[PDB]
Amino acid sequence: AAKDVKFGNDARVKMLRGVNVLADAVKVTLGPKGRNVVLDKSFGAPTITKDGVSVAREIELEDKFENMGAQMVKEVASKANDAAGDGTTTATVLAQAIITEGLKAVAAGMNPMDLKRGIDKAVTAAVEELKALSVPCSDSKAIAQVGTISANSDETVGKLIAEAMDKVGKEGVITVEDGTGLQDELDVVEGMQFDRGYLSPYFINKPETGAVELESPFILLADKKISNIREMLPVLEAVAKAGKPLLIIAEDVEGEALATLVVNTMRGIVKVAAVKAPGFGDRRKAMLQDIATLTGGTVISEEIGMELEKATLEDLGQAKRVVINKDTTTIIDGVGEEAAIQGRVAQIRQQIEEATSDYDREKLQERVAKLAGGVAVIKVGAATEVEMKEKKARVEDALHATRAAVEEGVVAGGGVALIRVASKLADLRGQNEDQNVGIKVALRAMEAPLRQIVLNCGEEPSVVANTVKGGDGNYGYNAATEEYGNMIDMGILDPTKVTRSALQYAASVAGLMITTECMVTDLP
Amino acid sequence: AAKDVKFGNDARVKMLRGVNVLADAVKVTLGPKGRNVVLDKSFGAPTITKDGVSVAREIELEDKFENMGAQMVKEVASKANDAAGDGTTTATVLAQAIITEGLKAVAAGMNPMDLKRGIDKAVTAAVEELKALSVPCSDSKAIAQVGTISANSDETVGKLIAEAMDKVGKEGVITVEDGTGLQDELDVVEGMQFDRGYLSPYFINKPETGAVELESPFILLADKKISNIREMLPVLEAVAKAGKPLLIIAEDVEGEALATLVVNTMRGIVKVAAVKAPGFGDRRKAMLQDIATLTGGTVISEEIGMELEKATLEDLGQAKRVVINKDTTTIIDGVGEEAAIQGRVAQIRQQIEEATSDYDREKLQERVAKLAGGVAVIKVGAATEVEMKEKKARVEDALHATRAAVEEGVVAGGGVALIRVASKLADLRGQNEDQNVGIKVALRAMEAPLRQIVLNCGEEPSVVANTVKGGDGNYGYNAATEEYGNMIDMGILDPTKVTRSALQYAASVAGLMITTECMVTDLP
Amino acid sequence: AAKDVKFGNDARVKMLRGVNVLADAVKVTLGPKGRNVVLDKSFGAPTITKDGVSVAREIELEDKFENMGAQMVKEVASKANDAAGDGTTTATVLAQAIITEGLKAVAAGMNPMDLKRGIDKAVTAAVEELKALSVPCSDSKAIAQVGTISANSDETVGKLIAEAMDKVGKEGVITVEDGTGLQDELDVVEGMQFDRGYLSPYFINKPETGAVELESPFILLADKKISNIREMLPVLEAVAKAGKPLLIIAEDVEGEALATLVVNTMRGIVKVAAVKAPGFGDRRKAMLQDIATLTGGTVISEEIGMELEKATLEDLGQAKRVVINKDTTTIIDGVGEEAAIQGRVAQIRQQIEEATSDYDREKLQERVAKLAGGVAVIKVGAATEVEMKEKKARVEDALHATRAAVEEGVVAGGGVALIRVASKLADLRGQNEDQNVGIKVALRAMEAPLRQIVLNCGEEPSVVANTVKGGDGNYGYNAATEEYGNMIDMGILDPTKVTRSALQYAASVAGLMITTECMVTDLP
Numbered sequence A, B, C: 001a002a003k004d005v006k007f008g009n010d011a012r013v014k015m016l017r018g019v020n021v022l023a024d025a026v027k028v029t030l031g032p033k034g035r036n037v038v039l040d041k042s043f044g045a046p047t048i049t050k051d052g053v054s055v056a057r058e059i060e061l062e063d064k065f066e067n068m069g070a071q072m073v074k075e076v077a078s079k080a081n082d083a084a085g086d087g088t089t090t091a092t093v094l095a096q097a098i099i100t101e102g103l104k105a106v107a108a109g110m111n112p113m114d115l116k117r118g119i120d121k122a123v124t125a126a127v128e129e130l131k132a133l134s135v136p137c138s139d140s141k142a143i144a145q146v147g148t149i150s151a152n153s154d155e156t157v158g159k160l161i162a163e164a165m166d167k168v169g170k171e172g173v174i175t176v177e178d179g180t181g182l183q184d185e186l187d188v189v190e191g192m193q194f195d196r197g198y199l200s201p202y203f204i205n206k207p208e209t210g211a212v213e214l215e216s217p218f219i220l221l222a223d224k225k226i227s228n229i230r231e232m233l234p235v236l237e238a239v240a241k242a243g244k245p246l247l248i249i250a251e252d253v254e255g256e257a258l259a260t261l262v263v264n265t266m267r268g269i270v271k272v273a274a275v276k277a278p279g280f281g282d283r284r285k286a287m288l289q290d291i292a293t294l295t296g297g298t299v300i301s302e303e304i305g306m307e308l309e310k311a312t313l314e315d316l317g318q319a320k321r322v323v324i325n326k327d328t329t330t331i332i333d334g335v336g337e338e339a340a341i342q343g344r345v346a347q348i349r350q351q352i353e354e355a356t357s358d359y360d361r362e363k364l365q366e367r368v369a370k371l372a373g374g375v376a377v378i379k380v381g382a383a384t385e386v387e388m389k390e391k392k393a394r395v396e397d398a399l400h401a402t403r404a405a406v407e408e409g410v411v412a413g414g415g416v417a418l419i420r421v422a423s424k425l426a427d428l429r430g431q432n433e434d435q436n437v438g439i440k441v442a443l444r445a446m447e448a449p450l451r452q453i454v455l456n457c458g459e460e461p462s463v464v465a466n467t468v469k470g471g472d473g474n475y476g477y478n479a480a481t482e483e484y485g486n487m488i489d490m491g492i493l494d495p496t497k498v499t500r501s502a503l504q505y506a507a508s509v510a511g512l513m514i515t516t517e518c519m520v521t522d523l524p
């Protein structure tokens, strides 16, 4: 199609316009007194949110060049959310500041590539300064403080997050879902629990709750399909001689074997329950091996050279507790040597280190948690569905910030650490005066977050920034309290990863935008 | 459909308009201080690029006559990128200069074919002068310098390119892909490696990394399908008697044979690993023959008159190392006579010389590299995706320029070589005064590259061109440094192939355009 | 649909408008200083061409009356290109002149049918005069001159055409294709060659070249599909006893026979190569009979009453050389009596004389060339694709003109012969003063070509035409040289067929167009 071509100042003005529109839409949610943004939904009611990336992702402009600017600036928020899950609004504000300063530097007729070089140098120095200024976030108090800061000053969310990591541990998995009541709740599960119920309600040994209870039972891990009873007469006789319950974790059990087992349960011969093997395919085999390791048994598969008829008591795993219900089976305290369990979790961690997809990494981490860690479920409770969405978004932001703080430490929140970095980097000079101008662009830029946080609170961004600059260390301005003091002491902790990634992505997008001279787009 | 027909001056003005629009869009990226262009993408965010052909290929004009002008001038950039992969912006600038001068000459009422003849004569003489002025580029310093020049003054890209060429060698293959971190990395593989993993995780002899290790093993190259164990009882017994590991590179292994082999591995009988034969079809047979030559074995195929049951230890290839993982198998230091390997690579090179498609040539060169050379992979690391694209484009341009410089030598960069050629070709005269006008058209034209390079730097193209003309040899104007000096000294090297091809394509397009008088296009 | 109807002068003005538009578009490429035209291509790049029929075929007008006038005048160029392949622009100019003069006469009360009668009489007399003035073009110098004239003053094209005709001969076939380099090349093939490679790479006795070489081999021509080896046990044993190589030109060879033959090759028993029979269907049978005649063998078919098992050494053709590669097999110096070969080519020539389709005629001529003549391939080399197209069009025009000159002789080029004819026909009178007006119309008309050729050179068409008329014989005006002299001596030779056909078609279209009084067309 025929193309519209822009050169020089027109394209730069269009980028500035799109960036300014997107940043103005996003930044109103920054800081403790940032307000909410409601996004129209064609299919359903409009959604109320405070997350900056959510607001940024819904921005599109009729003007094609300004649309280009909005798209290129949205990458900062997108990548900031992708990396740490927090500071997306701070990332957008930083990007807008860098874009503004660099464009007005370009307007002087001066070389844009040298501006990009200076901005990159200054931002690398800023990342180093932030890493040096990072202080570890390991205590539950600091975790709760980080969660509160990221959840828009919500102590309950940070407290629940710290409790989840404390109960579950570092190697466990913590997830957030919607609740049924008006309050949040936390559930912790240890051991292996897989979403596989009993294959027959007649296996239920307690009609009051409809559950199957197995005390110190054998576990037959069949990596195969059980179709005929004849394949498992030997193991059934072995179980009957042993007299202990049996749990058959198989791919599935057909009608004949299921009928025989349910008959034998109420005939008093063998107390046998049958459940399906969790997972599908290679993940099913991996989970079966995990169950074998934790229960000290051998998975029954034809691919290794053994048959179900040849299986004996040794090939049967053992566990202290087997809980079964309509949906889930939990194997609690299986007899498993810690050597095999730790070897298996080491193999899973090695696979994690060679896992690129986040889904595979999460599944492997959940497998480790079932083997060694735990599973936490946090249900969000409130009255309405918009409150569902907003509170869940705040909880997820708090969880991301808490994890980032745990893994990388904390720094003074509210843009105070960035002001300290700017003070420490006022001496940086590049290859020429042009890279010096780029460095000064970055230095003027990273003071934007505190200024915008204060602006959302209705106070003076300039006076606050000047007073914070006159201070040192963690001295700064609590925007929720509107008072000058130490950010670390009064709980204003920002993850170092969040700020560092936000600044890096903002700089990377803005420096390349600086060198723009021309656009080719479609005709309106 | 009804056709719009133009004649004479209006049509030539339309061609000049389209050429000027396309050249103005392209030339902003020329020179070390050239700026880059952001191109809007309908599917995704706009892409920031500095490659001239990339900007040229996105140009389309609403006016059908100017659209034809843009299309006909785009051929210069397209062919320049196709030939050497660099100098596309220089090609576009040269084409625009030749078009402008030739159309101006036509505006005087003089025969256009005489301009075409004079331009062709002058450009042929210029190609001869560039070939004579070409100095070889074999040292790694010159290669790194060429890469830096083509990568928009990036020393790291040229250094990595020189390192890859040195480690891998001349007959190897070097490729560039995107990385995962923020920095570029280089990986070199010597020997033979094919993307085939083990057919069973039970073949893994090291659960820590999930890999199969075979030390001094036999190699059974089956150019067939292995279905029954009975076909390989003789070779299995021979391997067991030998006691050395075995690697079966076959088309595929079914369930029965795979189960038997995995059983025998953990039963201690034979340490056997099975992988699929790389390639599909005739290329699979060629790769199997390559493996046979490198490992000194015989490929097992029914088309030659021998059977798998009749195969013995002699038909089994041997190698010092066999590495297998989930995806790849490397045969390291196979026992292969250099006579057979060199004959095979000679046959592959003969096929290359009779290979028209670039894909077939690349595959054959990769086969030679596996047999004799190596494989280099350069991962581009940076914060954002637009930086992915821009840095990878710069790296690819640098790689193309370095290869062109290695194969054809270097000349003084920044358009100095063309100015020297113009000084040496000021005496050329054609069949008539009109062909002399065409020669002067070409002579005025090839001074355009330095002028545009300096213009992108904000200095005086005319003063710079005059000062360079007053100089001699490689004396010129470093546009990045903005200083006069010998371009060879500070590393401003341009491949002779790049400039020669660019000038040839520009002249060939422009000379044929000049003789145009009439236009037939569709009605708007 | 409702029809728009025109009568009398308005319809004739519409005819003249369409004719004039098409002729003005076409005639800009006439003569040595004719221009080039760029035609817009919706699917691909616009094409630069100088061929008159190519420009004519792309002309369409919005006005339906002028559009149908353009359609009827396009028939002159179309038929001129169909007949001789050259002089299409001359045909268009002649048609425009005849149309203009006839319409001018009609406007004065002329009887249009009498104009048609007089024009036909004068043009028939002109054709007779051109035939009488034709001088044979048999020397390679005249052929090269004709090619140069038709290739827009390109000596190389005419020289290559003459060389191809000399090497290949009169009964051979010469074709023009695009090359890979920057220069034209000529390849001549004698004997017979068919595009069939070896059926197995194991047949290759020369792996360095990947070719099957057979010295004094038997030739088994199987007009059948061979499936089982048992069919060639007799002839395989006969060949083994003979000990000479064997080439099986069959419809195809299946897996069992191919495997047995490839086994027997490397076993040193029989040197057997297998290739597919060229052609499909009746043409395959004819080509197999051609191979039998040239190699002195018998084609093995079931339709005659003999079987492959009953075939002996006598049924096997013999030859001196058999060349096979991945694609082609050539039989060089087959032992074939000239009686059978000449009888076969006589039958093919008889089929040619009864062949209406040009494709069948070309295939039969190629069969004769394989049996008796040769095959020439001329590759066009140049930098760009538009130059591919333009140079190939010039080469094809030169080839057509050279063939027409060889078959019918030459006359003075540049419209000089037409002026001589007009001078010789100034005395022709028809049935009445009306047919005299028609004759004068034609006489005024055929002086147009030289006038337009000179007009394309920027000189005076009237002064040039007057000076040429004042001359005699081949005295005329070299428009490329702009000098008066003999056309024949300086190499401006025009094929008599080209000019005669052009004039005939122009007269036939124009005389009928003159007799029109009413138009019926669609409503806009």
Ligand SMILES: Nc1ncnc2c1ncn2[C@@H]1O[C@H](COP(=O)(O)OP(=O)(O)OP(=O)(O)O)[C@@H](O)[C@H]1O
Residues within 6 Å of the ligand: A029, A030, A031, A032, A034, A050, A051, A052, A053, A085, A086, A087, A088, A089, A090, A091, A149, A150, A151, A152, A153, A397, A412, A413, A414, A415, A449, A453, A477, A478, A479, A480, A481, A492, A493, A494
């Ligand atoms: N009491 C406070 N005093 C000063 N600054 C504060 C205070 N509470 C929060 N902040 C700052 O305000 C910001 C928190 O705003 P908010 O959580 O809405 O957005 P964000 O951290 O930029 O990212 P996201 O859009 O992903 O939620 C951080 O920069 C934080 O340091």
Ligand SMILES: Nc1ncnc2c1ncn2[C@@H]1O[C@H](COP(=O)(O)OP(=O)(O)OP(=O)(O)O)[C@@H](O)[C@H]1O
Residues within 6 Å of the ligand: B029, B030, B031, B032, B034, B050, B051, B052, B053, B085, B086, B087, B088, B089, B090, B091, B149, B150, B151, B152, B153, B397, B412, B413, B414, B415, B449, B453, B477, B478, B479, B480, B481, B492, B493, B494
């Ligand atoms: N320091 C320098 N001083 C002078 N000229 C330079 C310098 N560095 C590069 N050049 C010139 O500038 C040009 C390099 O620009 P650039 O690499 O962007 O485009 P290109 O070589 O025309 O091709 P492409 O569009 O394929 O990248 C070359 O003509 C080179 O000779």
Ligand SMILES: Nc1ncnc2c1ncn2[C@@H]1O[C@H](COP(=O)(O)OP(=O)(O)OP(=O)(O)O)[C@@H](O)[C@H]1O
Residues within 6 Å of the ligand: C029, C030, C031, C032, C034, C050, C051, C052, C053, C085, C086, C087, C088, C089, C090, C091, C149, C150, C151, C152, C153, C397, C412, C413, C414, C415, C449, C453, C477, C478, C479, C480, C481, C492, C493, C494
């Ligand atoms: N040097 C010359 N001096 C005079 N007339 C010439 C000269 N060279 C060519 N001509 C004339 O010019 C014409 C050749 O032009 P051109 O080959 O472009 O078109 P054409 O022969 O009419 O047909 P086509 O359109 O098929 O190419 C012929 O009439 C030829 O006699």
Ligand SMILES: [K+]
Residues within 6 Å of the ligand: A029, A030, A031, A034, A050, A051, A052, A089
């Ligand atoms: K926010």
Ligand SMILES: [K+]
Residues within 6 Å of the ligand: B029, B030, B031, B034, B050, B051, B052, B089
């Ligand atoms: K460029």
Ligand SMILES: [K+]
Residues within 6 Å of the ligand: C029, C030, C031, C034, C050, C051, C052, C089
């Ligand atoms: K022509």
Ligand SMILES: [Mg+2]
Residues within 6 Å of the ligand: A086, A087, A088, A150, A397
């Ligand atoms: Mg936040």
Ligand SMILES: [Mg+2]
Residues within 6 Å of the ligand: B086, B087, B088, B150, B397
């Ligand atoms: Mg370049």
Ligand SMILES: [Mg+2]
Residues within 6 Å of the ligand: C086, C087, C088, C149, C150, C397
């Ligand atoms: Mg012609």
